[model samples]
Target: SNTISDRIVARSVIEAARFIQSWEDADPDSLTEDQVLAAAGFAARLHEGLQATVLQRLVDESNHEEYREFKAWEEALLNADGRVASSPFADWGWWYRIANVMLATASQNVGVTWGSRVHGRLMAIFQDKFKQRYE
Candidate 1:
């Protein structure tokens, strides 16, 4: 959800994720860019809050394991040296970088008391929209 074109979209990656959600049953390759916009607009507000919180602020942006996971995902997806020799999202790599940055911020470096509040809000938003997604 956070990755659905994080910059507040039109034809961006944040919007891209919406397509993934709405057509959860469809093939990723079958998705035209248009399907993305509709789903993108649907979750704009929730992603905004998440962006604000995760990227709320940070100094040690690269230290936490959460950040490491994100970086690892990027490497696994983008690099061919050690991994499988391919990437399904080769061209769309930039799509979720913005949201991934936010996720990194939500980690331990975020100041739990303050961080917890931000995290809780995100949880509430998701649970509210689709209790099933959370449950």
Candidate 2:
């Protein structure tokens, strides 16, 4: 039995994942820098909504670990056109990986079982949506 907050966080992650992955379809040449920033803003907002101590710690740690790679990828996407475009959907892969790691740590920090499993289930839901996008 999950709490409402848990369900909301799960859904937020799924939606964010979908959005991140859909950026690849945008035409980088036509995208504005603001649009790229907006996408990042959305990601940040979703993360903020979690309001989970563990989620925050995970995000912070993950950002530290992957900031360089993320920045490089973001720059490449931005430079593709005069204006920045949507982020690469593949970005979701890293986001989820980091989130899962954080969730696991958070669970351990709080002595909660099944925290990572909850994330895994949510991820599977996201993957299903991803596959359906092409079907």
Candidate 3:
């Protein structure tokens, strides 16, 4: 019972949602490039924190077209093509926005389990940090 009851992942999701909601009124235009990057960093961390199976499931269930676009966006941002340098806000915002959307979608399908919880928590963490710096 304890093993089933102690679902840290579920708790993480709820807390993360609360954190992200805290920034519901944030002005996206005013956010700095660094803040956008921070959000991406948070998303990456959350992805890593979740169980591999769960992550794979989310990826597998995602729309292939959207996933390909997201991958392309990620590649352009990380590559030294000067794309990210020229438009850091757009680049980072695009990446973070996609991640947030994907996570939310996955959470809805998977229910508020440990994996979903971590996703929300990570977003919240990033948003909180961003608000502190630029809001």
Candidate 4:
């Protein structure tokens, strides 16, 4: 969170948020597990170590530790907790949807389904992290 890559990742997320909010996901609940995978693709564009670092930074910045849904999603993917439900994501909005997906892919590790579509939008905003600045 205090370094270039970390800042880049954070800014990527922030910008992605701005980009998504500019319009909106017409059907938030329609998202598929695969759509979430795009985050991994973007993260992999760099590397998982960096991606993991990016997620860790988000964890600290957002206090994700306090959110049961965030922790549960991560734990389910990491620990294979099939019993745990990702239903919580349904209540979240915009970047949160992408944010959690990125967190999942980077921390755990999708397609066009709902996740695929989100990846497309997010990649547009997130890829800009390489630029000198964001508007």
Candidate 5:
């Protein structure tokens, strides 16, 4: 048996994935703004988690494809395209723009592949990065 925290974290990760994918299974047109926002939270979480996992892999393994994919996404998210850019405390409109992109990417790439170690690393990375926002 694994640690209880692993099981708990694994459970949460799986549930979050299920909740987001529920949208893809249903009609996107029927989504309320609030519902989309809720899913976006999970999507952002998954995105950070995936980034942590991919970064960790980069340390020991040289994966050019993953690096290019992440670099492209990071550039896209941060750069303004005559509309909005993903920055701290941007307009809600920008939030929605970034949210939709994160939702699409995370749902397509990350779900059943990440292990407990990756989740742990994600937690560590998130806490560190989030703290830097105010500092």
Candidate 6:
């Protein structure tokens, strides 16, 4: 959480939260399970967009053992061409949980629950604009 990638990821998540909160009467629960899954996938994509060194750095900086374990589990699944879910590896629950934690914590920082169609716009904008910064 002390690294630039951590800040970048958090900032990306915050932007996502704001985008989700922009619509009228939007609540976190208003989004369907599919939508939640998509949003969580979005966070993962943002992480993947970072350089490998950034992920390595983040892992090194993390003091939490469980966080390291989760990272390893995620990497292993991805390396083996497997979907990240309990169905493939039911030993831990951090698959979707990490994404949920990021989205939820970002919402907390923004002081709002998540819900909106603007998320489509947000994703579009980020794909076009944000990737150029490093990629």
Please give each candidate's TM-score. Answer: 0.25, 0.26, 0.29, 0.23, 0.35, 0.38
- Best TM-score goes to which candidate? 6
Residue 49 in model 3: shift from native, Å?
Answer: 3.3
Deviation (Å) of 78 in candidate 4:
1.5
Model 6 steric clash pairs: none
Candidate 5, residue 71: Cα displacement in angstroms equals 2.0
lDDT of each residue in 1-135, candidate 5, tens digit only? 212223223534654655455444433445555445545455455455544543344332255654565454444434423223534323322233334443433434454333334333333333434433322
Candidates ranked by lDDT: 6, 3, 5, 2, 4, 1
- Candidate 6 accuracy as lDDT: 0.44
Q: Rank the candidates by TM-score, best first.
A: 6, 5, 3, 2, 1, 4
- lDDT per residue as tens, model 6, 1-135: 334335445646654554344433434446554444455455555545433433455454355764564466455445333343323222323223333344455455566554334334334333443343321
lDDT against the true structure, per candidate, is 0.37, 0.41, 0.41, 0.39, 0.41, 0.44
Clashes (backbone N, CA, C under 3 Å), per candidate, total: 4, 1, 3, 6, 0, 0
| Maximum-lDDT candidate | 6
RMSD of 4: 13.1
Residue pairs clashing in model 5 are none
lDDT comparing candidate 4 with the true structure: 0.39
- Report the lDDT tens digits of candidate 4 across residue range 52-130: 5434744443554334444533543332212343221223432334444453434321222336554454544444432
Where does candidate 3 stray beyond 4 Å? 1-11, 32-42, 54-135
Q: Residue 13 in model 2: shift from native, Å? A: 13
Q: Mind giving the per-residue lDDT tens digits that candidate 2 earns over 1-135?
A: 323234344656544444344433444345445435434443444434533333243233255535444454334334332245432234444335434533443353344444444454434434543332211
Clashing pairs in 3: 9-114, 13-117, 16-121
Higher-scoring candidate on TM-score, 2 or 6? 6
Q: Higher TM-score: candidate 1 or 4?
A: 1
